[PDB]
Amino acid sequence: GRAPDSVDYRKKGYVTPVKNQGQCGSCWAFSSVGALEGQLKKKTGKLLNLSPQNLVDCVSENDGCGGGYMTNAFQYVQKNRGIDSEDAYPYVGQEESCMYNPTGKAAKCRGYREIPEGNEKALKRAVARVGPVSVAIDASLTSFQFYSKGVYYDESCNSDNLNHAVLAVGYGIQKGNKHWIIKNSWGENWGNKGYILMARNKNNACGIANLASFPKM
Numbered sequence: 472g473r474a475p476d477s478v479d480y481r482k483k484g485y486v487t488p489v490k491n492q493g494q495c496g497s498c499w500a501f502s503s504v505g506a507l508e509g510q511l512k513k514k515t516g517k518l519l520n521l522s523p524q525n526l527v528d529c530v531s532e533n534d535g536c537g538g539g540y541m542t543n544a545f546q547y548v549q550k551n552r553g554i555d556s557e558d559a560y561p562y563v564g565q566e567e568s569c570m571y572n573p574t575g576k577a578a579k580c581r582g583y584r585e586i587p588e589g590n591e592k593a594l595k596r597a598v599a600r601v602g603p604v605s606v607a608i609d610a611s612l613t614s615f616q617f618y619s620k621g622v623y624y625d626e627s628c629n630s631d632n633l634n635h636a637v638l639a640v641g642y643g644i645q646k647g648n649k650h651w652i653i654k655n656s657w658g659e660n661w662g663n664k665g666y667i668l669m670a671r672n673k674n675n676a677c678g679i680a681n682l683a684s685f686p687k688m
C-alpha cells in the first residue's frame with residue numbers, strides 16, 4: 472500500500488513530552504489533546520502542549536475525573552471554537568469550573584473521524600495519512616502495569632474490555648514483532664519513558680483498533 476512500513480511521529484516533532492494524569496480519570500483528555508497536538512504540528516509547524524484541564528472542566532458530556540469519551544472532547548473543541556494551552560490552563564488533576572478563555576486559544580478543531588471497528592489495516596493507514604490517533608485499549612493486566620521494553624503481547628488481553636485511553640504515535644517492527652507505538656499518560660517513569668510498544672496485526676490485541684478516532688483541523 473501507500474502507507475510506509477514504519478512511521479514514528481516522535482521523530483517528526485509531532486509529540487509533546489509524556490504527561491502524568493495522576494489519580495484523576497482524565498485518560499480521555501490526555502488522549503484527545505495528544506491527537507490535537509499532532510494535528511496542530513502538522514497544520515502549523517508548531518508543537519504546543521494543549522490543555523487536558525480545559526477538557527476535564529468544560530466537556531459537559533463527559534464526567535471530568537469520572538471518565539469520558541475522546542469523541543466528546545473533539546466535538547467540544549469544534550463547538551467551542553478553541554482549546555487553550557497547558558501553560559496558561561494547567562493540569563491540576565481534579566475537576567474545576569470551566570475557565571476556557573479565547574485569548575489563550577492554542578488550537579481549533581473541525582470535527583473528528585472514526586477508524587472502522589477492529590480494522591488494524593485502516594488504523595495503520597490513518598496513522599500514516601493523518602498523524603497520531605486516539606485509541607482505547609485493555610490496560611487492565613498487571614503485565615501492562617509492569618511493562619518495561621519489547622513488544623507487549625498478552626493472550627489474556629481482551630479486545631472487548633476497553634478500560635484505558637492512549638495515543639498511537641506510530642507503528643513499526645522490533646525483533647520480528649510488528650507493533651504500535653503508544654504514548655501513555657502515566658508519567659515518564661512508567662513503561663519505556665512513558666511509552667509502550669503494543670503488538671500489531673495480532674488479531675486486534677487489547678482492542679487497539681476497536682474505538683480509534685482523530686480530529687480534523
Ligand SMILES: *[C@@H](N)N(C)N(C)C(=O)[C@H](Cc1ccccc1)NC(=O)OCc1ccccc1
Pocket residue numbers: 492495496497498499532533534537538539540541607608633634635636682
Ligand atoms: C481514564 N483515566 N479513564 C478513567 N477512562 C478509562 C476513561 O475515561 C474511559 C476511556 C475510554 C474511552 C473509550 C472507550 C473505552 C474507554 N472512558 C470512559 O470511561 O467513559 C465513561 C463516560 C462517562 C461519562 C460520559 C461519557 C463517557
Ligand SMILES: [Cl-]
Pocket residue numbers: 539540541542543682684
Ligand atoms: Cl471515544
